[PDB]
């Protein structure tokens, strides 16, 4: 089973002179997008991003939608507010971001509820592990701190995080579980490429896998080639699966001395493979 999470990623970007700020909320269950609200529409509504969510009635969508629109205008005001804290021109683009959510264990109990904010890509403030007190990241954030004490909102948020947030996480898990648990094994293979003089490049490819977490290693007879092995960041195929590779430069004629090891959560056992000159 493992632990589970319900997380909302929220962005508000000012664009003075170009219209209203762009506002975006993305809901994630277990790091997989399931709801999205985009302000860039004539009738912007909360919408489903995973098939299993179409299970929810029009009541749920209106309610979520309504919360989002009110969050958007609240952030619109926050944009102007921060222009004051920092003494910034009213003419430049600024960004507020929020991550808000709960992680629960296999038991179903709170593992860590939380809520951090960011201004212009930098930590602003954040509810601590203890859902009681705030960590302001700078002088301006110190203001928001009081305003959220004198107004009492760090308990209000605790209720949400330990209650409705957890209850709905369960609810979502129950409906999406079969789709969430989806696993795709990587298909691996090795490719061979030239290189100045008497060296060649061996590239080990892992394709079509999910989740994205994965590990590619190269071995010279049972030692892992730690240093100068080249590897790209895991990347979207664009179809729901991921691709990765890892490559090493080896002596010409010594290709059969190297082994690529592919470790992935969905394989019976790690893949082991070598260059295959056809």
């Amino acid at each position: 089973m493992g632990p589970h999470s319900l997380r909302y990623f929220v962005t508000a970007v000012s664009r003075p002179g170009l219209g209203e700020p762009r506002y975006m909320e993305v809901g994630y269950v277990d790091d997989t997008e399931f709801v999205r609200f985009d302000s860039d529409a004539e009738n912007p509504r909360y919408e489903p991003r995973a098939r299993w969510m179409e299970q929810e009635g029009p009541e749920y969508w209106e309610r979520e939608t309504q919360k989002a629109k009110g969050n958007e205008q609240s952030f619109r005001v926050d944009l102007r507010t921060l222009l004051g804290y920092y003494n910034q021109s009213k003419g430049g683009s600024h960004t507020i971001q929020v991550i808000s959510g709960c992680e629960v264990g296999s038991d179903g109990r709170l593992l860590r509820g939380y809520q951090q904010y960011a201004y212009d890509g930098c930590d602003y403030i954040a509810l601590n592990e203890d859902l009681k007190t705030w960590t302001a990241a700078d002088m301006a954030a110190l203001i928001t701190k009081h305003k959220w004490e004198q107004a009492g909102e760090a308990e209000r948020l605790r209720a949400y995080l330990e209650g409705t947030c957890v209850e709905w996480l369960r609810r979502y898990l129950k409906n999406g579980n079969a789709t969430l648990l989806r696993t795709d094994s990587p298909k691996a293979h090795v490719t061979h490429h030239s290189r100045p003089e008497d060296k060649v490049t061996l590239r080990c490819w892992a394709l079509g896998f999910y989740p994205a977490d994965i590990t590619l290693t190269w071995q010279l007879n049972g030692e892992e080639l730690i240093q100068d092995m080249e590897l790209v960041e895991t990347r979207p195929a664009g179809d729901g699966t991921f691709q990765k590779w890892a490559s090493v430069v080896v002596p010409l004629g010594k290709e059969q001395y190297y082994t690529c090891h592919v470790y992935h959560q969905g394989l019976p056992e790690p893949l082991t493979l070598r260059w295959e000159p056809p």
Binding site: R63, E64, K67, G70, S74, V77, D78, S100, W148
Partner: peptide, 8 residues
């Protein structure tokens, strides 16, 4: 579901 964010 989602929560309401406090005015900053």
């Amino acid at each position: 579901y989602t929560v309401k964010f406090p005015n900053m």
